[PDB]
């Protein structure tokens, strides 16, 4: 008997005012939020943001939409959402968001006999997430999604997570290329602007970057090259060709490491720890080359001086390199 | 009572002519602006603009919307904004702007018993900002946002900042990885076009570019390469291949220093500071190579002159490079 349902729905929407929230002027209307994360697409250090797709469900109660005699969850067409009051929920820290619209607008309206309304959307949002890259690539990031009411204050609307810590699901299934999600957290609070106090929900993920490949790629080769640069100290100065070959090899390897690192790193124009470490290693090999040049210039007239400076360099280069590594470890690790 | 409020609003909107501004045919309507800056997402030199996200609030008074009997301020659903009169405010120097629309259109309408209307939007705008890069990377930019009325002259509308110097807030939320906010300024004036005089507001920021990245990436490598090019003067001139290879390597490496960062700049016709420093270093290394070529040319006939030239170069080159650095860093800092 679709005629009875049609009559009931027409009666519900007859005289309905979409400009007035439920219980207008009375106690605030409570909205419960559920989020199902379909996927986190990409995390960008260049743009300081991340893209995230989700099913976003809001649950509330409107006494105007109460019907009796129909023992069913009335699942209506999504266009009915244009004839009802819905919360003005928005994401505070987003840059570009949209609701999917193929094949129709991705939206669900479900009414319940007591007047309860369930309103679901499928949203893909790019959200800002400032990152601290000083300790790159040991950095650990914390990216948030902020949910807030735009127009209504805490005197009119209230937010809460439906089901508590079970409100957000599907985080465990997310796989990212660079990062691995460690822990997510849900927070509910109030935020005061000059226009008043608004409810606020926060969903935050803590991301730890994968570190093995970088360590095997940029730190170990640099350390090995700096160690190899000291072999020429033990080489006697009679065979200058071997020392020239060693210097050329070390410089070529350092340049190759630097170019590959430039290729790997995002092009964010600000300082990072790995850049300083590579610069220090290059300065060390450059100093070794200059010391060899000084030995070559001196050895012909004063062989004792050249032997002495080589012998002293043999002990003062590893000590200085170890001191630099200790300073780097304390300052950035 | 919800029905009483609904009938009050219906009576307010009955006979309301949207096509006519408040006080049509009479004194101009005064509109006050507030801006709350959320973030400046990016500042592009290539495209010569900057992206800015803000809360834009407009405050005015319409006697047609005055209501009595309700000691409340009516926060209405944003859709009612489609049925009221709002100022035709536009931004003169914006290239692509939009109002965020997830989950609903980020718009706010609030009415007061006096008839005063508060209208709020959340807007992301990409505003053009022409830049003078003659002192790059030690430059300092000044980016403005211009706010104007399109269809209404100073006889129909007036603009002012609500709160004076406190009209714009949230400047401390701006976090540019490459710049730093130095000062923000508010201006109010009139602009005369062929169709009349229009009110104009202006919000201007002054940006100071960070230097550490360029010191680590450009200046230090250039100085190191220039210093390494001086090792040629401490090598016996009989080793022609070694000195020639060192000179050629230094010249070619100096020609290819800022290639990575010179592909994110516009094709400007003038010389920046970094270009001048690189050209100076190139001149130094080229002169070192020419000095060796001359020494090799006069090596056989008069070895004493060649030795004297090398000895004098050993002192002249570092001193002149130090003087060049002194003059450069005094002029540009």
């Amino acid at each position, epitope marked *: 008997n679709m005629s009875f349902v049609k009559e009931t729905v027409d009666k519900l929407l007859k005289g309905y005012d979409i400009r007035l929230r439920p219980d207008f002027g009375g106690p605030p209307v409570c909205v419960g939020m559920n989020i199902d994360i379909a996927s986190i697409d990409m995390v960008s250090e260049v743009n300081m943001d991340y893209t995230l797709t989700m099913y976003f469900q809001q649950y509330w109660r409107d006494k105007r939409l109460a019907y009796s005699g129909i023992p069913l969850n009335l699942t209506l067409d999504n266009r009915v959402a244009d004839q009802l009051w819905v919360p003005d929920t928005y994401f505070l820290n987003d840059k570009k968001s949209f609701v999917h619209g193929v094949t129709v607008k991705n939206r669900m309206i479900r009414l319940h006999p007591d007047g309860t309304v369930l309103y679901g959307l499928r949203i893909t949002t790019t959200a800002a997430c*400032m990152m601290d890259l000083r300790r790159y690539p040991l950095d650990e990031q914390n990216c948030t999604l902020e949910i807030e009411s735009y127009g209504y204050t805490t005197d009119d609307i209230e937010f809460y997570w439906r089901g508590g810590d079970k409100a957000v699901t599907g985080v465990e299934r997310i796989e990212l290329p660079q990062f691995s999600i460690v822990e997510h957290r849900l927070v509910s609070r109030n*935020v005061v602007f000059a226009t008043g106090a608004y409810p606020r929900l926060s969903l935050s993920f803590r991301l730890k970057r994968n570190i093995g490949y970088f360590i095997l790629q940029t730190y170990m080769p640099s350390i090995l090259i700096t160690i190899l640069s000291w072999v020429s100290f033990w080489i006697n100065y009679d065979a200058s060709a071997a020392r020239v070959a060693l210097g050329i090899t070390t410089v070529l390897t350092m340049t190759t490491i630097n170019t590959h690192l430039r290729e790997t790193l995002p092009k964010i124009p600000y300082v990072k720890a790995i850049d300083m470490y590579l610069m220090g290693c290059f300065v060390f090999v450059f100093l070794a080359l200059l010391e060899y040049a000084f030995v070559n210039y001196i050895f012909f007239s004063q062989p004792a001086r050249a032997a002495a400076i080589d012998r002293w360099s043999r002990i003062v280069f590893p000590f200085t390199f170890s001191l630099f590594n200790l300073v780097y470890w304390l300052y950035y690790v | 009572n919800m029905s009483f409020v609904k009938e009050t609003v219906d009576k307010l909107l009955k006979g309301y002519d949207i096509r006519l501004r408040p006080d049509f045919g009479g004194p101009p309507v005064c509109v006050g602006m507030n801006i709350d800056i959320a973030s400046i997402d990016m500042v592009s030199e290539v495209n010569m603009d900057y992206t800015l996200t803000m809360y834009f609030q407009q405050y005015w008074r319409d006697k047609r919307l005055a209501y009595s009997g309700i000691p409340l301020n009516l926060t209405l659903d944003n859709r009612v904004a489609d049925q009221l009169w709002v100022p035709d405010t536009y931004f003169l120097n914006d290239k692509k702007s939009f109002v965020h629309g997830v989950t609903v259109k980020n718009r706010m309408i609030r009415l007061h018993p006096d008839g005063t209307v508060l209208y709020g939007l959340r807007i992301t705008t990409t505003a053009a900002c022409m830049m003078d890069l003659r002192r790059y990377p030690l430059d300092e930019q000044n980016c403005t946002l211009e706010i104007e009325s399109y269809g209404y002259t100073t006889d129909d509308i007036e603009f002012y900042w609500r709160g004076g110097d406190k009209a714009v807030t949230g400047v401390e939320r701006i976090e540019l990885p490459q710049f*730093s906010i130095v000062e923000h300024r508010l201006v109010s004036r009139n602009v005369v076009f062929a169709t009349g005089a229009y009110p104009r507001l202006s919000l201007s920021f002054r940006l100071k570019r960070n230097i550490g990245y360029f010191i680590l990436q450009t200046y230090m490598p250039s100085i190191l390469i220039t210093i390494l090019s001086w090792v040629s003067f401490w090598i016996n001139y009989d080793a022609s291949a070694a000195r020639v290879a060192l000179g050629i390597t230094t010249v070619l490496t100096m020609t290819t220093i800022n290639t990575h960062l010179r592909e994110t700049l516009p094709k400007i016709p003038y010389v920046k500071a970094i270009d001048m420093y690189l050209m100076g270093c190139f001149v130094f290394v080229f002169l070192a190579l020419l000095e060796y070529a001359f020494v090799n040319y006069i090596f056989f006939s008069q070895p004493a002159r060649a030795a004297a030239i090398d000895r004098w170069s050993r002192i002249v080159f570092p001193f002149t490079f130090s003087l060049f650095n002194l003059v450069y860093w005094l002029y540009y800092v």
Partner: nanobody
Framework: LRLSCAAS????????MGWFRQAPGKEREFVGA????????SYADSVKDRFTISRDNAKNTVYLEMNNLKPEDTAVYYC??????????????????WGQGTQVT
């Protein structure tokens, strides 16, 4: 005089430091705020040109210097940290971590 607020821990997630003072018979009042990194300061109208605020990230410290003090400045001071999306700057509610209460006459 001069007061120093030193912060330790996850100071990146709270890039704004603020100063508040509570009168013996009144509520907490905003004084000043400073970005941790940007070095931009905001002051209340009652203490403009008399107080100054600076910051140094070498040891994660922020300095509030008081000049031309007046007897009506007898309040207990507090240094607080504010999140990146905590909202307004002049409201004590938005600040999460509060420093030690300091009494200055």
């Amino acid at each position: 005089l001069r007061l120093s607020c030193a912060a330790s821990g996850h100071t990146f997630n709270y890039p704004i430091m603020g100063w508040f003072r509570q009168a013996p018979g009144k509520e907490r009042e905003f004084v000043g705020a400073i970005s941790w990194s940007g070095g931009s300061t905001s002051y209340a109208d009652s203490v403009k040109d008399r107080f100054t605020i600076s910051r140094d990230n070498a040891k994660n410290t922020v300095y509030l210097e008081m000049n031309n003090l007046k007897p009506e400045d007898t309040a207990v001071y507090y240094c607080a940290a504010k999140g990146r999306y905590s909202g307004g700057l002049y409201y004590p509610t938005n600040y999460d971590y509060w420093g030690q209460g300091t009494q200055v006459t």
